[model samples]
Target: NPEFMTKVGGLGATHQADKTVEDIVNAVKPSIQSKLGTNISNLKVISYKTQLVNGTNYFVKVRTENGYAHLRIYKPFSGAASLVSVQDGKAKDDEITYF
Candidate 1:
């Protein structure tokens, strides 16, 4: 999971001193694999951007041959636990029920 920078460049801290970008991406690689249930070679990290939103915010976009998904992570600079989220598809508009 190479979190390569997209069109977004020099927006903020693209690289960290204590850890490398690959480190961050690789750190969460397993999580992504589990959710996608696919080989790592089939996926590609298209782009990533980092923002200082009250602390730090990172966005990762992953793509397969015909599909894609996003992984968003947020953390506080004060050492609090971070939050991670993933979105693979849009919700259906049809009035279906399962809950």
Candidate 2:
């Protein structure tokens, strides 16, 4: 029998449902706004997966005015969180996967 792997620097196997996810999302609002080319006042994070690298990678499913989008945000030790990439045009039921 094998247990779920919970290794640091590797993406989490299960989704995280926490308000902290929102905090991380908020920290990169500007980045997301810049990437999406829209003024983002509010966006809902359905769920997220965390990967610890040199910094932390937050892979999230966000609900926006336009359906949904998967975002990969990076939070370095000293700098503000940044949006790494986004996959827009995703479904509401889509899973949050590593990109």
Candidate 3:
């Protein structure tokens, strides 16, 4: 599993007035649990940064990890929707599969 320890990161956006980093993270718990078949507590938010915009708004950079997967989420105010990206060390592009 040590091979799956590689870091992962990405960017996304969220409604400034409507969401918190924790809120969005918690919201995705079901998805993660469903996909990984494990508890969300196994994941750790290593660092998070947020900024405000417009009236009362925030843009966030969230970094998290669970076992061999690294997760990054970005959320900003305005037209963009929340986005998440995951990197797993176990994922690979096999030459034979493509052949």
Candidate 4:
């Protein structure tokens, strides 16, 4: 988990994919596709977690035709979202952990 200065910015624990998570993942599909070298149609978000930063760090587990890919996306408080990191060649059983 990320260390916090106070309580507003830190890595939150993992959670299942809900409407919010899905929305974020969907919003960042283009970034994910470019990084993973896959198409948006092939990308399916299965689960995810989040870290509350000045913006928010989204740790997402996505399914592709090949298998799965884990991604870290950052959405700022006043800017567009961006892909922070990505891990491909994963599986459904892969755990979504902090990176």
Candidate 5:
């Protein structure tokens, strides 16, 4: 199974770069496809972009599934750097939140 981590601030509390976006997708696609079934089509990489904040470079966004979902990359201001989702084009309202 792929290791998953959660974070606060910029990215996450722990980060791993041993895999690329394509790698992650390839690793996880089977589960997603199996769960969603064949109705979903055209699974592919759509777009990739980066952003810079506080002198830290962040892999910002990767648009896919005709913009239905997004793969966002982030680097924490004081923690780890990991890829996270900022779903549905929603702007981050704050630096942190509590569930």
Candidate 6:
């Protein structure tokens, strides 16, 4: 792990926004339901992106019991801009892989 750690220019920290990732996620929860047609039981932010002027965006992967899953784009940490439904957090055409 130490060998691979050196590859990132030795700066492990990344840009942090004014709000926490969890806060951003909280703000967008409702829309997630409408977009995917199901409420998220739990969430884990697999990845995220942020810019100086462009607000933070997140790739949230979530699955609910007896519900739906999606690969969603949350912009400005406000709401979902777009989404593609998945089978237990997976997309077709890529078998055995979760998207």
Q: Which candidate is the best by TM-score?
A: 2
User: Which pairs of residues clash in candidate 1, taking residues 3 or more apart in a chain or in different chains?
Assistant: none
The candidate that wins on lDDT is 2
Clashing residue pairs in candidate 4 are none
Ranking by TM-score: 2, 4, 1, 6, 3, 5
Error of 4 at 83 (Å): 1.1
lDDT of 4 at 44: 70
For 1-99, candidate 1 gives per-residue lDDT tens digits of 122333332234322223433445566777767776667665665555566567666655556554766666565676533327766652322111111
For candidate 5, the lDDT comes to 0.39
* lDDT digits (tens) for residues 1-99 of candidate 5: 112222323333222223444554454454434433433345554433334465343332223344433444444456545444444442332221211
Q: At residue 3, what lDDT does model 4 achieve? A: 37
Using lDDT as the measure, name the better of candidate 3 and candidate 6: 6
Clashing pairs in 3: 12-74, 13-76, 14-76
lDDT of 4 by residue, 1-99 (tens): 323321344445667778876777777788887888866685677877777778888888888887788898888888667788898888888766667
**By lDDT, is 1 or 2 better?**
2
- All-Cα superposition RMSD per candidate: 10.8, 4.7, 11.4, 4.1, 11.0, 8.9
**Per-prediction TM-score:** 0.50, 0.77, 0.36, 0.77, 0.31, 0.41
- Candidate 3 matches the true fold with a TM-score of 0.36
- Candidate 6 off by > 4 Å: 1-19, 41-53, 66-99
Q: Distance (Å) between predicted and true CA of 59, model 4?
A: 0.4
RMSD of 3: 11.4
For candidate 5, which ten residues in a row score worst on lDDT?
90-99
Q: Which model, 2 or 3, shows the larger TM-score?
A: 2
Point out the higher-scoring one by lDDT: 2 or 5.
2
